[PDB]
Design a protein around this ligand. Structure first.
Ligand code: HEM
Lengths: 77, 225, 203, 113, 127, 100, 188
């Protein structure tokens, strides 16, 4: 359940044993959620809406930094 | 002799043998939740909690036999040349280690060996148990290893209380010196004698609390056979 | 013939008289490479300084400043003890400049080679050696004329972590002491006037 | 008496300092929270170094061939040479200039073929 | 010894320790432009050099001339002296340029959040 | 100063240690010259009261008594955070236990 | 003080039956060899005697140095060293004579008296350093003669240690001639 960006970057991640250590290199692997889109007038409003919905959902989600279920970890690796 | 360590060990054994700490009499549950929820603690943490209070759910004779086997295995393992070299290096790199809280080279190896010994003791204590997955101890995370090393107990150390007293000669105040001269001489003496000797004594006490006794020494005391 | 002359160096010295005549002929002919090879052979039969200088110059292609032919013209068995001032000075300058050029080439190829050599030398060196003052800057300009140049000295209280590159177990402290003592004894046998044992006392 | 009070205060301070500097060697604490702190510090240092190495590997993976050679040189400099004193920044610049000379030759060939 | 004290004061004030340019700057800060012996004379200095709010032509001319002379001298210098130690400031500048190159290469392929998190963790670890 | 003396020193050094571990894929004379130049450039501050030949002999003896083959040597000053972070990470206790 | 004691021990180790004599003396004093050695070190520290073997101006500094050495010696924890010294003079009053009566100890003491102590030394003159250096040179010559005499017999490590101890004692005399001579006279 991962994107090709993760496995490519996961292949570049070496010398890690604990998921906590992988929990340290979190934002480095966060690039797999690029979500590329155009800069059209319609897409820009949609992009703003998506970003607002994601930010507002995370506050209600309130998951701890160790629990990153939305970001694949060392198990998939 | 009301030796602190021996008395504390006997009190702990009596408390755990009173039956008021047997695991069957209590149901471990996370009391925080408003709805009754069982203990959702980690598997390694639960195993450590069980091993730490091993005698509480065990009988006296069972504790005696298991502890005897575990202690024999621990003595045999600590008799290894690698452990001897590690202990020698730890004893050597002492004074410099007293100069900062940054860990020395031999101390990290000591911690790793302590974690390995904790794993071995946890495996040996319940060696007859048929509901424990030894492979679960294969690879531990940072938190898992830190938790496991917490209950590690070097059994080869002297069980006697290490609290002692040392007498350091005190230089008297000269009757021919003035206030300033006496203060200067006293400050110089205080530093040069007390600080080195005091630091050495404290480090020696800590090391003795950390350095286990030699196997033959135990044999020389009849502690083990 | 000249290659055969080399065999004369390996063969008995009966042909050295014939080799001496051939060397006189070669000095008359003013050879560049053949003279160098003949000098290397003959001065390997006698001493080693001249042979090493001739071989190294031939390898470096020191065609210019070929005064060695005049050195080859020396009659003491086609050699000479206490060679001319030019012969010694030229060889010394050649060795020094070759060392400098090789060091420059190594720095251009492996910039860490110099630091690696220094660390390898100073790792097991005496403690006083580790207190050697840092090198100074010879640069010119407004610095060293108008302002004040900051020094490059440091605390120099380090720990030399020696790990074998081949992974083999290193020599123990006692083994290193024994090897150092044996090498010092061998050197003292070579050099009557030396304070090497004093260095063994850690300065 | 005053010396006695001074000696008692000094003994207390020395014992506290020994605990604050050597308790990681001893197993006095029931939970061994001091040794846990030392193990955590060692693990954090190892994690920082490993994260640096992994970032270097990822950067090497996400670059071209000439870019990879230049990144290798620059990373070796910033890793070892930057903390070393007997290394030549002039030599590093010379290697970089040779690479740039090859690149400029390629650029001129492209712009004027 | 008072003589020793005077000798030490003189030695510490040597040009090898006290920059002559620093001494000149101190003298300039201590003397007014009217009483500035080195400056009250040269009228072009008092009018053309520092008397113009905008002397861009003169500034550009001086910069171009200095740059050309320094480029020629630098070519001459880099054409020789294969084994010599440069000034500490220059060596630090070169090392800083290399470090800036490495940092830009890192920043190209790294997220700002990851970089900030790593830097904060490193600072906490250092503390 | 003497060519014969320099050659004798070079011969003694060659019979004593192997410059190939010092510099790989090079001639013995060039290796000796490079070693002398490096010693002069770096160990000059101690050459005032110590003979150059003696200092070279001591350095070579130490470098060969550490091991007869090539080794990796790192200088770390634990007083610095960067070095201390590198000191512990680069060091493996089992390695020391193996005398490697 | 401690250097002189070490030199005396090294010189007494050479003599034969000295161990048996020390054991006999310790048995007469109801002590062991180690206790006898410690008591002998205490007896050597005779501050009252030290009051008469040095110039008065050097007494306070010498007294402080002796107190520092005692607190740094193994017998510091015994108590007020000066008073503790008197304790020895009351506990085994005659043992002092035994301290010079043993074979190896007597030989070492006689050698120390001969090599170092000479009549040319003026105690009040010890405040200067030039006379101290001259006495150090003379004692160095005497120590070379004594080392040669010792090397004439016993045919190694003991001889080398004795020579090193003599050199160290000469160095101590060079550094502080007044204190060194006062300590030598007090020990004698
Ligand atoms: C417009 C005509 C003048 C020109 C082009 C001229 C040019 C210069 C220049 C280039 C300097 C050196 C400044 C520097 O490079 O830092 C200088 C300094 C000086 N000039 Fe002039 N100057 C002129 C007029 C004068 C006059 C009229 C006087 C006399 C009243 C004078 C006296 C000085 C003095 C005393 C110095 C300082 C020299 C030293 O301190 O070693 N200059 N001038």
């Amino acid at each position: 359940q991962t994107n090709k960006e993760w496995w490519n970057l996961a292949k570049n991640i070496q010398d890690v044993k604990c998921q906590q250590e992988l929990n340290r290199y979190n934002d480095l692997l966060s690039q797999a959620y690029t979500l590329s889109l155009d800069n059209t007038i319609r897409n820009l409003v949609f992009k703003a809406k998506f970003y607002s919905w994601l930010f507002v959902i995370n506050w209600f989600k309130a998951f701890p930094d160790d629990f990153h279920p939305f970001i694949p970890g060392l198990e998939m690796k | 002799p009301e030796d602190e360590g021996i008395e504390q060990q006997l009190d702990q054994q009596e408390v755990l043998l009173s039956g008021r700490y047997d695991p069957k009499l209590y149901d471990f549950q996370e009391g925080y939740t408003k709805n009754p929820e069982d203990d959702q603690t980690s598997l390694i943490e639960k195993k450590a909690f069980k091993f730490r209070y091993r005698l509480a759910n065990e009988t006296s004779e069972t504790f005696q036999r298991r502890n005897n086997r575990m202690v024999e295995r621990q003595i045999k393992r600590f008799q290894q040349p690698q452990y001897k070299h590690a202990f020698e290096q730890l004893q050597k790199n002492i004074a410099i280690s007293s100069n900062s809280g940054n860990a020395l080279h031999s101390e990290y190896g000591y911690l790793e060996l302590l974690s390995n010994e904790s794993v071995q003791l946890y495996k040996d204590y319940y060696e007859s148990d048929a509901e424990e997955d030894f492979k679960v101890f294969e690879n531990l995370s940072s938190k898992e290893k830190l938790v496991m090393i917490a209950n590690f107990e070097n059994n080869l150390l002297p069980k006697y209380d290490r609290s002692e007293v040392h007498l350091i000669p005190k230089r008297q105040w000269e009757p021919a010196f003035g206030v300033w001269e006496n203060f200067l001489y006293d400050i110089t003496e205080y530093a040069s004698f007390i600080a080195p000797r005091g630091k050495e004594i404290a480090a020696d006490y800590q090391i003795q609390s950390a350095i286990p006794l030699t196997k033959e020494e135990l044999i020389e005391a009849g502690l083990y056979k | 013939a000249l290659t055969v002359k080399s065999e004369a160096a390996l063969w008995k010295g009966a042909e050295q008289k014939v080799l001496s005549g051939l060397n006189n002929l070669a000095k008359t002919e003013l050879v560049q490479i053949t003279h160098h090879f003949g000098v290397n052979k003959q001065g390997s039969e006698a001493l080693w300084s001249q042979l090493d200088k001739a071989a190294v110059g031939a390898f470096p292609e020191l065609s210019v400043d070929e005064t060695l032919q005049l050195i080859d013209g020396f009659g003491e068995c086609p050699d000479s003890y206490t060679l001319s001032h030019d012969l010694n000075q030229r060889l010394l300058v050649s060795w020094e400049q070759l060392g400098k050029l090789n060091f420059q080439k190594l720095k251009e190829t492996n910039p860490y080679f110099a630091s690696d050599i220094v660390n390898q030398l100073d790792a097991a060196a005496a403690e006083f050696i580790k207190v050697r003052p840092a090198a100074e800057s010879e640069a010119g300009g407004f610095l060293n004329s108008l302002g004040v140049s900051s020094s490059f000295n440091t605390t120099k209280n380090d720990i030399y972590v020696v790990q074998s590159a081949s992974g083999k177990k290193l020599n123990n402290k006692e083994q290193r002491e024994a090897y150092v003592l044996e090498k010092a004894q061998k050197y003292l046998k070579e050099d009557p006037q030396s304070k090497i044992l004093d260095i063994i006392a850690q300065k | 008496a005053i010396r006695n009070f001074v000696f008692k205060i000094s003994n207390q301070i020395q014992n506290l300092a020994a605990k604050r500097s050597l308790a990681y060697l001893n197993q006095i604490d029931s939970q061994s929270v001091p040794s846990r702190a030392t193990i955590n510090m060692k693990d954090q240092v190892t994690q920082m170094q490993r994260e640096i190495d992994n970032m270097a590997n990822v950067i090497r993976a996400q670059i071209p061939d000439e870019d990879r050679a230049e990144f290798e040189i620059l990373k070796k400099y910033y890793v070892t040479g930057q903390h070393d004193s007997l290394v030549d920044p002039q030599d590093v610049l010379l290697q970089l200039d040779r690479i740039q000379v090859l690149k400029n030759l390629k650029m001129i060939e492209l712009n004027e073929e | 010894m008072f003589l020793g004290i005077f000798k030490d004061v003189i030695k510490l004030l040597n040009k090898k320790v006290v920059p002559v340019y620093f001494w000149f700057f101190l003298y300039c800060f201590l003397s007014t432009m009217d009483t500035n012996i080195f400056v009250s004379s040269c009228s072009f200095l008092k009018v053309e050099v520092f008397g113009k709010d905008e002397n861009t032509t003169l500034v550009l001319l001086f910069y171009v001339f200095y740059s050309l002379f320094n480029f020629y001298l630098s070519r001459i210098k880099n054409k020789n002296n294969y084994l010599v130690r440069k000034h500490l400031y220059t060596t630090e500048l070169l090392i800083e340029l290399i470090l800036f190159k490495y940092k830009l290469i890192i920043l190209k392929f790294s997220s700002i959040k990851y970089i900030l998190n790593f830097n904060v963790r490193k600072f906490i670890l250092f503390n | 100063i003497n060519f014969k003396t320099k050659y004798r020193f070079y011969k003694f050094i060659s019979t004593n240690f192997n410059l190939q571990t010092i510099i790989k894929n090079c001639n013995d004379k060039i290796i000796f010259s490079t070693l002398l130049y490096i010693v002069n450039l770096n160990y000059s501050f101690f050459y005032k009261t110590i003979k150059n030949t003696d200092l070279i002999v001591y350095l070579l003896a130490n470098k060969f008594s550490i091991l007869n083959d090539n080794i990796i040597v790192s200088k770390f000053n634990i007083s610095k955070f960067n070095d201390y972070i590198k000191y512990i990470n680069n060091t493996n206790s089992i390695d020391t236990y193996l005398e490697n | 003080w401690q250097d002189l004691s070490k030199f005396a021990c090294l010189r007494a180790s050479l003599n034969k039956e000295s161990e048996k004599a020390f054991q006999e003396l310790a048995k007469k004093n109801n002590v062991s060899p180690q206790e006898l050695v410690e008591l002998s070190k205490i007896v050597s520290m005779n501050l009252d005697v030290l009051k008469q073997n040095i110039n008065s101006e050097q007494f306070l500094l010498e007294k402080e140095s002796t107190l520092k050495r005692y607190r740094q010696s193994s017998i510091g924890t015994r108590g007020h060293l000066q008073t503790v010294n008197e304790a020895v003079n009351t506990k085994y009053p005659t043992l002092a004579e035994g301290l010079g009566q043993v074979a190896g100890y007597k030989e070492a003491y006689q050698a120390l008296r001969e090599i170092f102590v000479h009549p040319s030394i003026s105690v009040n003159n010890l405040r200067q350093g030039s006379y101290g250096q001259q006495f150090a040179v003379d004692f160095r010559t005497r120590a070379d003669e004594y080392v040669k005499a010792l090397l004439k017999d016993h045919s190694v490590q003991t001889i080398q240690e004795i020579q090193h101890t003599l050199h160290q004692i000469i160095k101590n005399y060079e550094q502080n001639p007044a204190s060194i001579y006062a300590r030598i006279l007090t020990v004698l």
